Design a protein around this ligand. Structure first.
Ligand code: CA
Lengths: 58, 224
């Protein structure tokens, strides 16, 4: 799995609440978080399948 | 909204909820068939919910209308956040009544120190996730552009202004974006961004609606 899979999830500065997935390396699985709508970092996926494909877990 | 209070029921008849699965952004009703929101709230399908107070319970004043057209400002920049504004055309006109009605576009931008009303169903905590059932309100003043730029050096474009407090604890937050800042009976701001929510020395940043009066009126005319 790529290095960015290990980075904490990043809501960012914008003030929407968009459901996204991140890989939680501590839990070994993709989980949901609230994304603000702009300036996403790389550990931010539109589906669990996208997250699992890139970062693993589950 | 962090550090605010529950609005009086249906006392902000121009406030709408944007819903896709669940509530994700706010908006402001500015004509029978048009809503103003933020460009970063864009989705290809949106249901607009008017007349809401408690978004989890049927109260009997609601109107749910799907968006027919969704139009981002053509100069929106998703990296600088410049021109963060969007229009939504409703598939049918909203029924205008005591609990659902329009907010006036502004004839002048608001002076520093002007007290404004900011509202939404966004997070009520600066840390954690407490998304409220009932609509929240915050009374907050317009900051000088100099203080706004000093708070966020290099980041404040001509489309942006700050409203809030430097001491912390009172601000808009996630799921408030796209919603209204109303001052002296006019829609002056769209909830946009900030660093955290209600952090010290990091006030809320809002789109200056006054700069888009012509764009709004012409876009309505071109799509109506
Ligand atoms: Ca309701």
């Amino acid at each position: 799995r790529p290095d960015f899979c290990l980075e904490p999830p990043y809501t960012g500065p914008c003030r929407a609440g968009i459901i996204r997935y991140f890989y939680n390396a501590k839990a070994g699985l993709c989980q949901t978080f609230v994304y603000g709508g702009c300036r996403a970092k790389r550990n931010n996926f539109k589906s669990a399948e996208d997250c699992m494909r890139t970062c693993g877990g589950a | 909204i962090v550090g605010g209070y529950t609005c009086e029921e249906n006392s902000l008849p121009y406030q709408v909820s944007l819903n896709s699965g669940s509530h994700f952004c706010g908006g402001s009703l500015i004509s029978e068939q048009w809503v103003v929101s933020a460009a970063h709230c864009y989705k290809t399908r949106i249901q607009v919910r008017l007349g809401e107070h408690n978004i989890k319970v049927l109260e009997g004043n609601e109107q749910f209308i799907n968006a027919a057209k969704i139009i981002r400002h053509p100069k929106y920049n998703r990296d600088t956040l410049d021109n963060d504004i969007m229009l939504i055309k409703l598939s049918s006109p909203a029924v205008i009544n005591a609990r659902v009605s329009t907010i006036s576009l502004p004839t002048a931008p608001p002076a520093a120190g002007t007290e404004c009303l900011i509202s939404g169903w966004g997070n009520t905590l600066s840390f954690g996730a407490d998304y409220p059932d009932e609509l929240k309100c915050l009374d907050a003043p317009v900051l000088t552009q100099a203080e706004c730029k000093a708070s966020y050096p290099g980041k404040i474009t001509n489309s942006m202004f700050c409203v809030g407090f430097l001491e912390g604890g009172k601000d808009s937050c996630q799921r408030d974006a796209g919603g209204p800042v109303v001052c002296n009976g006019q829609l002056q701001g769209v909830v946009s961004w900030g660093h955290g929510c209600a952090w010290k020395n990091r006030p809320g940043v809002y789109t200056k609606v006054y700069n888009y009066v012509d764009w709004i009126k012409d876009t309505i005319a071109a799509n109506s």
